[model samples]
Target chain A: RMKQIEDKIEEIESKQKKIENEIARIKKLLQLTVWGIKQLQARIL
Target chain B: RMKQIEDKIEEIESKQKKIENEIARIKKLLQLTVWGIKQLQARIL
Candidate 1:
């Protein structure tokens, strides 16, 4: 039972890490999106 | 030239407002994503 709990915890941690990575990825993309918008503004205005 | 600058500034302001709206939209979605992850963790762990 203890090993089973450990396994579950390890699995959860791995999944959480992946989620953190995904959040980071989204942040980068969001930043790029904002940058693109700013570039367009610079060109148009 | 003053009127032209005013128009340009207004246009930039409008675009910036839209970008702000987009950011708000993304923030809501990101919050939802994290909330969903938490729900899953609660259920699984």
Candidate 2:
């Protein structure tokens, strides 16, 4: 029969998901910033 | 007389320094990347 192992596994998986989401958010922000940078560069050209 | 508070304070200050250094590194990297991007863009022009 299963015990507290499942509970610890779920907690770890949940933390991993949060980390993944935070990384995704940072990636999107970087992409957006790069896009803006290009737009500003275009104006200078 | 001070207790363990100084130890805790020093620990937090050390961590803050590490975080500041990390941010500075990232800022420099981004600046370098942008400079590279401009060089590449110049070639295309």
Candidate 3:
């Protein structure tokens, strides 16, 4: 009777979303960095 | 007699430090963007 699978999966996803957000925050930083470098390179170099 | 846990905790912290370094790498990107913005604003605005 431990197969209350829906509840278990939902909880797993709740934890996973936190990890996904952390990964996304890093991705956004990387993208913004690249954009800044390209724009600056055009002006300075 | 399975009472040894020190080694496991040591590895746990080692891996955690690797993550901290990775976050620091991303932070450098954020700084680059800010500096670029400042340089551009000097010229444009």
Candidate 4:
């Protein structure tokens, strides 16, 4: 039977790096939206 | 508490999708690297 690859420390580290990058990207986008909203408010005021 | 749990699950699922996409990209890059290395070896030998 073909064996599945077991998770290793390096694999986990790679996964973490991927997750961190995703979080960073999400945060950046959220910040951009917040900034855009603030700019809109400033324009109105 | 149930509502909190539901929200948490949704948050996790969203993060999981993001991580999965990243993993897919990384795998693609690794495959490209392997192909490049094999080509280089063939040229060298």
Candidate 5:
């Protein structure tokens, strides 16, 4: 599992948020990497 | 206090789950990327 994804769940559950908007950032990168993967898959397969 | 956070989590849980499912396919692909990263360098960069 994605570590930051796990932690973001925790912070959202507790108001003692050590960080803000990280999930959003991770999601952004995830989207990018995912798109890259899809593109690569078409090439590889 | 953070008591309300628990309630919030239930909602986030449902929402977050959707994203996990969305990425489940690529997780298999991501694992390969992660492993390759480990092979390449400090790997997390």
Candidate 6:
């Protein structure tokens, strides 16, 4: 029997990579946003 | 069902954390290996 899909390590690793990429992208965007906000504040003050 | 979905999310999160930890460990190991190789090369040359 093939068993369940979740039993496969490769499938889980693929999902983990997707989640990691998404998290990394979001983190980069957050850092950029914070930097932009700080620069804007400096310009305003 | 909502409970089943929530459980799935928990499962995914746990798996993601495990994967992240594994990746982080591997990265650290790689960094150490590179550093060791550089040191050894400098000593040999």
Best by DockQ: 5
Question: Residue B20 lDDT in model 2?
Answer: 53
lDDT, candidates in the order shown:
0.62, 0.61, 0.64, 0.59, 0.59, 0.62
| Model 5 agreement with the true structure over A1-45: per-residue lDDT tens digits | 445656776766564232225545666787787676656556555
Off by over 4 Å in 4: A1-45
Kindly report which residue stretches of model 5 are placed more than 4 angstroms away from their true locations once superposed. Answer: A1-20, B1-45
- Per candidate, native contacts kept equal 0.00, 0.00, 0.21, 0.00, 0.05, 0.05
Provide the lDDT at B26 for model 5. Answer: 54
> Chain A TM-score of each model, in the order shown?
0.86, 0.73, 0.57, 0.67, 0.54, 0.70
Off by over 4 Å in 2: A1-33, A36-45
Which segments of candidate 3 are over 4 A away from where they belong? A1-24, A36-45, B1-4
Minimum summed lDDT over a 10-residue window in model 1 chain B is located at B1-10
Interface C-alpha root-mean-square deviation, candidates in order:
24.5, 11.5, 6.6, 18.1, 10.7, 14.7
B1-45 in candidate 3: lDDT tens per residue?
Answer: 112244444554565576667678767867877787777777765
lDDT of 5 by residue, B1-45 (tens): 355556666787776676566567556766876764454444224
Interface RMSD of candidate number 2:
11.5
For the predicted complex of model 3, DockQ is 0.12
Predicted candidate 6 versus true structure: per-residue lDDT over B1-45, tens digit per residue? 456555666887787777678568656655665565565556556
| Of candidates 5 and 3, the better by lDDT | 3
* Poorest 10 consecutive residues by lDDT, candidate 6 chain B: B32-41
Give the worst 10-residue stretch by lDDT in candidate 1 chain A.
A36-45
Please tell me which predicted candidate would have the highest TM-score against the true structure. 3
For model 3 chain B, where is the 10-residue window of minimal lDDT? B1-10
Better of 2 and 3 by TM-score: 3
**DockQ each:** 0.02, 0.04, 0.12, 0.02, 0.13, 0.04
Task: Looking at model 2, give its docking quality level.
Answer: incorrect
What level of docking quality does candidate 4 show?
incorrect
lDDT tens readout by residue for model 2, B1-45: 133544554565566556556655765776676687667667656
DockQ of candidate 4 relative to the true structure = 0.02
Instruction: Note the residue pairs that clash in candidate 4.
Output: none
Candidate 4 per-residue C-alpha lDDT over A1-45 given as tens digits, one digit per residue, 9 for 90 to 100: 111222333364577667787767765765565566556546544
